[PDB]
């Protein structure tokens, strides 16, 4: 199977900074783009930031200039830095992977989701 | 979903792929006439391109598999009790519709595999490869137990045996699919997507355009008609293209191993790798133009086709695995799937353009004189 480990969530004051670490063990080299998705309580899933294998940076329009996401291909770990946290970002962030299964003449993609960490900011 | 149902689903997907490619593999093995192969490839590519854009109903898959089975039955009955002209007309129209139906079946099976957890695209591809290997193995086993009567240029007993094997595989795949599968129920413009991932499209058209340029009608058709290769040796020659082509698509996948670390390299190095593949054209032509004993050798002919077979599949999976690295402006997950649609389209154009440019060599006086 493919397993994802996430750590860094917690309760901090507004305007803080946290570092979220996501790592993959099962699939080593077939991962194409890893990213983070947030799901607010009583709300649907939304995109936060994804980094591809060729260093392609994607972001949500509401997090531009505040979140920095970096990758370390040596150990297949992707880290996300959040700066100046605000109350509306209180949600659960789940790491995501995008694996290509392309044994030939057809490319198929899979989504692997971790358990995720709960991030709440108040006061 | 426990282990038993997962195993059954993997088996039925492998079997669907195997039974879909069985017809093409046995058409290659039986030394069928070249124009039939061209018609089959044209039908397959046209149907695949059409079905990529249109969400065809997913219930019809067993119906077209049964149509494939009855087409094989018609093939048998035409080789049995039809005269030459009607046999030719039938066989050609049947091959066109067979290509169309096989393309539709492949598209439907891949769509079924994609829209479910624990994708079976790898299992279907493994099924196609095992179809090639299985056809080669049964042809090799059948060669020494069948008299070569050569009714209409095709062995009667071999044709009957291979096609009844294909029919039984098709019907048992039908029952497996019915029992297992459930048949009830801001983006950038395409110009930016094309102008960005253009190397991946080009590197995939080139490999399929060149492989299908030679192997159909020059890989073993012109060698045997210019050197009088025995039918026993032809089966080895054609049948080892379809065993090394399947084996060559794995090493790119197991890149984590030290030995296969350099098998997936880059896109820029792929264009220069396809340029070196153009050196296969003189080698294939030279094998059908010189009588000097080294060229008139079974092992050299086998190895020369083996090298083309290995570089075909290996260069057909690399553009799928490395094109995401080269992407610059296509970052959304939706554009990754859209670009991948361009890649498979670029292959079918390569197969379609591959077969027809084989007729370019007809102008050249490649074939040696009969005496």
């Amino acid at each position: 199977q493919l397993q994802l480990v996430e750590s860094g969530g917690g309760l901090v004051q507004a305007g803080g900074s946290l570092r979220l670490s996501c790592a993959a063990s099962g699939s080593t080299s077939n991962i194409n783009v890893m990213g983070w998705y947030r799901q607010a309580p009583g709300k649907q899933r939304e995109l936060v930031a994804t980094i591809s294998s060729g260093d392609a940076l994607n972001y949500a329009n509401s997090v531009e200039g505040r979140f920095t996401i970096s990758r370390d291909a040596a150990k297949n770990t992707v880290y996300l830095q959040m700066n100046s946290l605000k109350p509306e970002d209180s949600a659960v962030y789940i790491c995501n992977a995008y694996v290509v299964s392309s044994y030939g003449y057809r490319a198929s993609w899979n989504d692997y989701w971790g358990q995720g960490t709960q991030v709440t900011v108040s006061s | 979903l426990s282990s038993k149902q997962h195993f059954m689903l993997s088996l039925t997907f492998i079997l669907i792929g195997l039974s879909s490619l069985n017809v093409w593999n046995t058409a290659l093995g039986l030394n069928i006439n070249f124009k039939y192969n061209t018609f089959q490839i044209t039908g397959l590519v046209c149907s695949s391109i059409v079905a990529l854009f249109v969400e065809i109903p997913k219930i019809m898959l067993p119906f077209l598999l049964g149509g494939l089975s009855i087409l094989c039955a018609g093939f048998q009955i035409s080789h049995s009790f039809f005269t030459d002209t009607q046999f030719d007309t039938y066989c050609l129209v049947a091959f066109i519709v067979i290509g169309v139906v096989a393309g539709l079946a492949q598209t439907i099976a891949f769509n079924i595999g994609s829209t479910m957890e624990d994708n079976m695209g790898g299992y279907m591809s493994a099924g196609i490869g095992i179809s090639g290997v299985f056809i080669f193995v049964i042809n090799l086993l059948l060669d020494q137990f069948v008299s070569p009567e050569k009714h209409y240029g095709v062995n009667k007993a071999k044709l009957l045996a291979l096609y009844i094997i294909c029919e039984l595989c098709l019907i048992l795949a039908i029952v497996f699919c019915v029992c297992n599968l459930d048949l009830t129920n801001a983006t950038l413009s395409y110009m930016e997507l094309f102008k960005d991932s253009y190397k991946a499209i080009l590197t995939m058209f080139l490999v399929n355009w060149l492989t299908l340029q030679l192997f159909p009608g020059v890989g073993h058709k012109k060698w045997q008609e210019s050197h009088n290769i025995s039918d026993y040796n032809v089966t080895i020659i054609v049948g080892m293209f379809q065993v090394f082509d399947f084996l060559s698509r794995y090493p790119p996948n197991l890149t984590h191993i030290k030995i296969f670390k350099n098998f997936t390299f880059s896109l820029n190095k792929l264009l220069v790798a396809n340029s070196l593949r153009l050196l296969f054209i003189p080698w294939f032509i030279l094998n059908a133009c010189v009588d000097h004993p080294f060229f008139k050798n079974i092992v050299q002919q086998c190895v020369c086709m083996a090298m083309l077979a290995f570089t075909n599949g290996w260069f057909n999976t690399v553009p799928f695995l490395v094109f995401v690295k080269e992407l610059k402006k296509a970052k959304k997950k939706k554009e990754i799937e859209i670009i991948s649609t361009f890649l498979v389209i670029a292959m079918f154009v390569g197969l379609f353009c591959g077969i027809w440019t084989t007729y370019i060599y007809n102008l050249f006086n490649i074939v040696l004189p009969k005496p």
Side-chain angles (χ1 to χ4, degrees), chain B residues 70-367:
Chain B
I70 68 171
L71 277 159
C72 270
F75 254 124
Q76 273 144 0
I77 209 163
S78 48
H79 202 65
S80 295
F81 332 106
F82 283 10
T83 81
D84 51 65
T85 38
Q86 33 209 266
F87 175 88
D88 184 1
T89 55
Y90 168 65
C91 160
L92 75 94
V93 70
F95 261 128
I96 283 183
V97 302
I98 273 180
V100 159
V101 152
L104 289 180
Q106 283 184 20
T107 283
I108 284 171
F110 273 139
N111 286 5
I112 288 280
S114 91
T115 83
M116 70 188 328
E117 71 295 19
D118 293 346
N119 73 197
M120 321 285 168
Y123 289 93
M124 177 103 175
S125 307
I128 283 181
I130 294 187
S131 152
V133 155
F134 179 65
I135 278 291
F136 173 43
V137 152
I138 66 176
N139 201 355
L140 258 190
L141 151 63
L142 248 173
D143 270 350
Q144 43 264 60
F145 299 150
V146 157
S147 48
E149 55 90 51
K150 282 266 147 32
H151 187 63
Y152 282 174
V154 188
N155 220 339
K156 272 177 64 175
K158 200 171 303 184
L159 179 130
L160 294 203
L162 289 190
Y163 274 29
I164 63 176
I165 290 205
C166 177
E167 284 181 321
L168 72 94
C169 210
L170 254 189
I171 65 164
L172 84 84
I174 271 292
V175 317
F176 258 24
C177 173
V178 173
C179 154
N180 213 162
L181 279 197
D182 194 54
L183 310 148
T184 68
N185 272 115
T187 317
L188 269 74
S189 176
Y190 295 86
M191 191 56 28
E192 288 93 328
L193 293 172
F194 205 107
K195 79 192 288 275
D196 158 62
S197 89
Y198 85 96
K199 292 175 184 178
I201 288 174
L202 169 63
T203 40
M204 204 162 188
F205 162 79
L206 284 180
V207 47
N208 266 313
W209 164 69
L210 166 71
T211 285
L212 266 284
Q213 167 151 310
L214 302 189
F215 159 70
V218 188
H220 89 270
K221 287 290 194 70
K222 261 176 202 298
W223 298 358
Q224 80 147 319
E225 99 183 40
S226 179
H227 298 316
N228 272 317
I229 303 184
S230 176
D231 198 339
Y232 282 46
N233 277 36
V234 157
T235 285
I236 302 178
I237 280 182
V238 63
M240 105 183 308
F241 169 76
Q242 56 195 21
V243 66
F244 274 165
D245 166 74
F246 153 61
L247 260 56
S248 78
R249 300 183 147 117
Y250 283 30
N253 289 126
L254 316 89
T255 322
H256 52 86
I257 314 185
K258 182 57 170 274
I259 178 59
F260 311 130
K261 186 254 198 177
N262 296 58
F263 266 69
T264 64
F265 33 86
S266 294
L267 268 191
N268 280 6
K269 298 179 182 179
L270 202 56
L271 286 89
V272 317
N274 287 159
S275 63
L276 302 187
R277 256 175 73 81
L278 280 172
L279 282 153
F280 263 129
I281 279 175
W283 200 14
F284 269 48
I285 278 182
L286 262 280
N287 265 125
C289 275
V290 193
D291 194 318
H292 150 256
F294 163 72
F295 275 162
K296 191 209 299 281
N297 199 352
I298 172 65
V299 55
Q300 183 273 340
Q301 280 155 26
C302 279
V303 162
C304 173
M305 182 94 87
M307 210 44 217
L308 170 76
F310 201 77
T311 64
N312 183 27
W314 173 31
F315 284 10
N316 247 15
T317 76
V318 158
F320 273 138
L321 300 199
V322 307
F323 84 102
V324 199
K325 277 203 163 221
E326 254 79 7
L327 291 171
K328 296 321 228 155
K329 310 181 150 295
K331 309 170 181 179
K332 279 204 58 193
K333 267 178 204 221
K334 255 161 191 173
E335 291 147 310
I336 312 290
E337 299 171 351
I338 294 297
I339 289 179
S340 171
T341 281
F342 294 163
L343 282 179
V344 282
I345 283 169
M347 144 193 306
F348 290 130
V349 161
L351 306 184
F352 172 78
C353 287
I355 43 154
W356 289 115
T357 73
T358 299
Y359 292 84
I360 296 299
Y361 310 135
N362 278 7
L363 318 174
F364 285 6
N365 209 345
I366 291 183
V367 152

